[PDB]
Design an enzyme around this catalytic site. Sequence first.
Site, PDB file in Angstrom:
ATOM      1  N   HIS A 182       0.892  -1.425   0.254  1.00  0.00           N
ATOM      2  CA  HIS A 182       0.344  -0.055  -0.015  1.00  0.00           C
ATOM      3  C   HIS A 182       0.705   1.315   0.303  1.00  0.00           C
ATOM      4  CE1 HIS A 182      -1.674  -3.344   2.109  1.00  0.00           C
ATOM      5  NE2 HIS A 182      -3.017  -2.992   1.357  1.00  0.00           N
ATOM      6  N   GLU A 237      -3.113   3.425   2.256  1.00  0.00           N
ATOM      7  CA  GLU A 237      -2.618   3.799   0.868  1.00  0.00           C
ATOM      8  C   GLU A 237      -2.761   5.397   0.479  1.00  0.00           C
ATOM      9  OE1 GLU A 237      -3.898   3.711  -3.574  1.00  0.00           O
ATOM     10  OE2 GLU A 237      -3.880   2.598  -2.831  1.00  0.00           O
ATOM     11  N   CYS A 282      -6.440   0.972 -10.803  1.00  0.00           N
ATOM     12  CA  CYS A 282      -5.346   0.305 -11.666  1.00  0.00           C
ATOM     13  C   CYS A 282      -5.782  -0.718 -12.535  1.00  0.00           C
ATOM     14  CB  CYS A 282      -3.977  -0.720 -10.699  1.00  0.00           C
ATOM     15  SG  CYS A 282      -5.477  -1.743  -9.489  1.00  0.00           S
ATOM     16  N   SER A 328      -9.510  -5.560   2.814  1.00  0.00           N
ATOM     17  CA  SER A 328      -9.137  -5.062   1.798  1.00  0.00           C
ATOM     18  C   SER A 328     -10.642  -4.314   0.883  1.00  0.00           C
ATOM     19  CB  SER A 328      -9.293  -6.997   1.273  1.00  0.00           C
ATOM     20  OG  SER A 328      -8.885  -6.428   0.079  1.00  0.00           O
TER      21      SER A 328
HETATM   22  O1  LIG Z   1      -7.092  -2.796   1.252  1.00  0.00           O
HETATM   23  P1  LIG Z   1      -6.443  -2.904  -1.052  1.00  0.00           P
HETATM   24  O2  LIG Z   1      -7.612  -2.759  -1.469  1.00  0.00           O
HETATM   25  O3  LIG Z   1      -5.616  -1.137  -0.042  1.00  0.00           O
HETATM   26  O4  LIG Z   1      -5.475  -3.874  -0.245  1.00  0.00           O
HETATM   27  P2  LIG Z   1      -5.133  -5.806  -0.200  1.00  0.00           P
HETATM   28  O5  LIG Z   1      -4.010  -5.479   0.559  1.00  0.00           O
HETATM   29  O6  LIG Z   1      -6.406  -6.412  -0.516  1.00  0.00           O
HETATM   30  O7  LIG Z   1      -4.524  -5.954  -1.969  1.00  0.00           O
HETATM   31  C1  LIG Z   1      -3.155  -4.671  -2.487  1.00  0.00           C
HETATM   32  C2  LIG Z   1      -3.061  -3.793  -2.609  1.00  0.00           C
HETATM   33  C3  LIG Z   1      -3.202  -2.397  -3.357  1.00  0.00           C
HETATM   34  C4  LIG Z   1      -2.264  -2.025  -3.256  1.00  0.00           C
HETATM   35  O8  LIG Z   1      -3.377  -0.935  -4.352  1.00  0.00           O
HETATM   36  S1  SF4 Z   2      -1.639  -4.031  -8.977  1.00  0.00           S
HETATM   37 FE1  SF4 Z   2      -3.196  -2.026  -8.907  1.00  0.00          FE
HETATM   38  S2  SF4 Z   2      -4.414  -3.397  -7.084  1.00  0.00           S
HETATM   39 FE2  SF4 Z   2      -2.617  -4.517  -7.514  1.00  0.00          FE
HETATM   40  S3  SF4 Z   2      -0.863  -3.533  -5.706  1.00  0.00           S
HETATM   41 FE3  SF4 Z   2      -0.386  -2.848  -7.493  1.00  0.00          FE
HETATM   42  S4  SF4 Z   2      -2.627  -1.113  -7.555  1.00  0.00           S
HETATM   43 FE4  SF4 Z   2      -2.664  -2.405  -6.424  1.00  0.00          FE
END
Ligand SMILES: O=P(O)(O)OP(=O)(O)OCC/C=C/O
Ligand code: SF4
EC number: 1.17.7.4
Length: 309
Positions: free
Chosen positions: A74, A126, A197, A225
Site C-alpha cells: 500500500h 494507501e 489500476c 481489503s
Molecule cells: O485494501 P486494499 O484493496 O488496498 O489492499 P489489498 O491489500 O487487499 O490488496 C493489495 C493492495 C492494493 C494496493 O493498491
Molecule cells: S496492481 Fe493495482 S491492486 Fe494490485 S497492488 Fe498494484 S495498484 Fe494495488
Amino acid sequence: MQILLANPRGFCAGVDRAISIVENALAIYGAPIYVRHEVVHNRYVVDSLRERGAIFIEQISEVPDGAILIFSAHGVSQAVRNEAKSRDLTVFDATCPLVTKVHMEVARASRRGEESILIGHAGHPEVEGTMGQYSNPEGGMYLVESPDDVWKLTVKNEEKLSFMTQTTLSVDDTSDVIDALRKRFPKIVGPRKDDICYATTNRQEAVRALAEQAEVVLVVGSKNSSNSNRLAELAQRMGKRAFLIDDAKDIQEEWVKEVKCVGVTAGASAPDILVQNVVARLQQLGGGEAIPLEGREENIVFEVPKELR
Ligand SMILES: O=P(O)(O)OP(=O)(O)OCC/C=C/O
Ligand code: SF4
C-alpha cells in the site's frame, strides 16, 4: 447448482511482487523480517508469512536497531520513509509500482506549491501514504470520498489545482466524484480518467459479468481489503446477494440453498488455494464442475528488486 468463476480474479501484479519480496528477503536473510502493516490485506497470506517468521508491526518504534524492514504494498508516507532512514534499519520497499506512480504525482504537485485533491477512503494506509507525499504548506492536500465532500471543499487557489485517486476504488463511484470536481473546479488538472489500476478495473468488470449470470456471488477476500469490498458491493448493487468471505468455512448453507447459479471471485490479495477450497465446499453443497468465464487477459508482471534475487 452451476458454479461460475469470474475472470480475472485473485492476485494482481503488485500483490504477487509484494509477497515475493517478503519470501525472498526471508530466504536471503533468515527470520525475522519485519513488515510494517500487513504486507497485503489477506489473513491467509499474512498468517502464512507470520508463521514463517515475518513479523508484522504497525509502527517503526516496534522494530529493533539493525533489523530488516519491508514497507507494505500500500506504500508509506515521506515521514515513515524518513523515520526508517533516520534509524538503523535496512529497508526494502514492496509498495506497488502503480501506487508509487501516484506518489510521484503528489510529490510533484507539492514541490510546485499547487494544491492537490485525493479521492480515497479516509484511514486506509494507501491514502495515508499518498497524502503523506505532500509537504508544502504554501499549497494543500485535501481528501474527498464522495460528491458531497467535493460540494463542501474550499481551496486557496482553484486556478492551480490537481487531483489523484486511490488505486482500488469503485470505477463507477469515482467517476461521479470526478464529474463533481470538474463542475466545482473547472480548471482542475488530472489523469485522462483516474488512477484506478488495471487490476481493479478488470476485477470490477469481471464481477459485473459474473453477477449478470449468478444469483449469489461469493467474493474471496479479508474484511479490511478495500478492493475486495468493492467487488461485493458491485454485485449487491446489481441486486444479487453477495458475501465477502475469508475462506470456505465462512459459507453458510442457507446462502446457497435452492440457488441454481452461484458465482465466485477473489480480490487482488486472495491466493488461488482459497478459491479452490471454496469451490470444493460449494460442490459439497451440490454444485457441479466450476466453469470459468471468458475474460480480459492480464499480462503485466512486476519483478522483485534485483537485490532480492
Ligand atoms: O485494501 P486494499 O484493496 O488496498 O489492499 P489489498 O491489500 O487487499 O490488496 C493489495 C493492495 C492494493 C494496493 O493498491
Ligand atoms: S496492481 Fe493495482 S491492486 Fe494490485 S497492488 Fe498494484 S495498484 Fe494495488
